[PDB]
């Protein structure tokens, strides 16, 4: 009943806004932003439909702002490995699952800038290293800066770039198991990367209290599937694939880590 995710990407892409959007989603029936400068984690226990879930989201500093960005992935990778390390020591000492705190990163949400072009070399290098040790779901950040047509065309280009550079992204096609896993996973692969919009403000729209971005032309409703694809990301992580992500972390990624220990 513990689920951990991490937001990764260049600064100025709405990452910290998206962390708040996740905890503030109207889907939960429970209770409860400068340029982030170091890694810090926020933990809140949310209740979906009577089910209890301790959700931790780790927010990260950006990269790519400097002239030389070499090794800018080291803090993030260091965090992911230190959670694998801590878990191995705990499994050795206290043997039972019920008593081991799981701080392992079960999914990384990687924020791609909405350039409309294609994946930058910097993002390719970062993605190729993250997928080597963690689940990665990429998203088109701040996607309201593109039109509907432009999001779709940009999604396809990125999907092509991922294939060219062999970046196997979640849901990885090799781990498709049962007959109809693919029938539901291909529908998700076709949508990934999700074109997401983040909001930490509530607005009253036609008698409805919704999360949204208030602009001069209207309110962009981030939980409205006609406005953006945030509900797909929110449901993939928390509702439909939470267990599948945790299974892959523990059985593949974590087991691959102890091959060096
Ligand atoms: N247009 C648009 N702006 C956003 C979105 N999410 C956040 N912002 C704005 O982007 C700026 C930086 O957002 P922030 O959450 O700090 O991103 P971070 O630097 O990655 O942590 C702020 O002015 C936000 O209000 C979005 O989905 N669309
Ligand atoms: Mg931030």
UniProtKB/Swiss-Prot annotation:
Q: In which tissues is it expressed?
A: Widely expressed. Expressed in lymph node.
| Positions of region (G3 motif) | 59-62
In residue numbers, the region (G1 motif) covers: 9-16
What is the annotated localization of this protein?
A: Cytoplasm; Cytoplasm, Cytoskeleton; Cytoplasm, Cytoskeleton, Spindle; Nucleus
Q: Where is this region: Interaction with SEPTIN7?
A: 1-261
Instruction: Provide GO CC annotations from the record.
Output: cell division site; cleavage furrow; microtubule cytoskeleton; midbody; nucleus; perinuclear region of cytoplasm; septin complex; septin ring
One GO MF term, please?
Answer: identical protein binding
Looking at the record, which segments are called G4 motif? Answer: 141-144
Where does the record place the Septin-type G domain?
1-261
How the protein is affected by changing residue 9 to N?
Answer: Abolishes binding to GTP and to SEPTIN11, and also abolishes the ability of SEPTIN12 to form filamentous structures
Instruction: Name the job this protein performs.
Output: Filament-forming cytoskeletal GTPase. Involved in spermatogenesis. Involved in the morphogenesis of sperm heads and the elongation of sperm tails probably implicating the association with alpha- and beta-tubulins. Forms a filamentous structure with SEPTIN7, SEPTIN6, SEPTIN2 and probably SEPTIN4 at the sperm annulus which is required for the structural integrity and motility of the sperm tail during postmeiotic differentiation. May play a role in cytokinesis (Potential).
Name assigned to this protein: Septin-12
Q: Which organism is it from?
A: Homo sapiens
Instruction: Recite the lineage of the species.
Output: Eukaryota, Metazoa, Chordata, Craniata, Vertebrata
